[PDB]
Amino acid sequence: INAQLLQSMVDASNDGIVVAEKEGDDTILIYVNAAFEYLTGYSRDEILYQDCRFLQGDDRDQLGRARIRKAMAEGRPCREVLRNYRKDGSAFWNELSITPVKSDFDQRTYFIGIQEDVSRQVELERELAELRA
């Protein structure tokens, strides 16, 4: 499959897709797609080369953080549902998928992130539970 098609497929994805690399305790972003920019509200120039933890804002007491750190250290993919905050400050539920992959071009392991906004389904399920009473 051609590389231009793959880049287009990434650029056409509804879910957000990012690529990040490890720099100590930070995993700084090296690629984001348009979907990620519209989901998070930040432009490409602002958040490039930054760890995604800024999406958590002040809600930094989420147990999923430790699970993410364990998964990335051990080279395992992981899936976590987190509360994240856009640039304007509005909250949303982000189903995040992290996948570590070893690039053979430079023998470096990178991390692929897929973000899904699941706020709508969270609200729907909650309302169904309320009506169940």
Ligand X SMILES: Cc1cc2nc3c(=O)[nH]c(=O)nc-3n(C[C@H](O)[C@H](O)[C@H](O)COP(=O)(O)O)c2cc1C
Q: Is 108 annotated as a binding residue?
A: no
17 touching ligand X, by CB under 6 A: no
Q: Is 51 annotated as a binding residue?
A: yes
Question: How many beta carbons lie within 10 A of that of residue 123, not counting itself?
Answer: 11
- Residue 12 sits at the vertex; the CA angle it makes with 75 and 82, to the nearest 5 degrees, is 45
Please tell me the distance from the alpha carbon of residue 82 to that of residue 115, in angstroms, as a whole number: 10
Please tell me the distance from the alpha carbon of residue 76 to that of residue 56, in angstroms, as a whole number: 22
Q: Is 132 annotated as a binding residue?
A: no
Q: Find the binding residues for a copy of itself in span 100-119 (CB under 8 A).
A: 101, 103-105, 110, 112, 114, 116
* Residues within the interface to a copy of itself (CB under 8 A): 1-10, 12-15, 17, 19, 31, 77, 97, 99, 101, 103-105, 110, 112, 114, 116, 121, 124-125, 127-128, 131-132
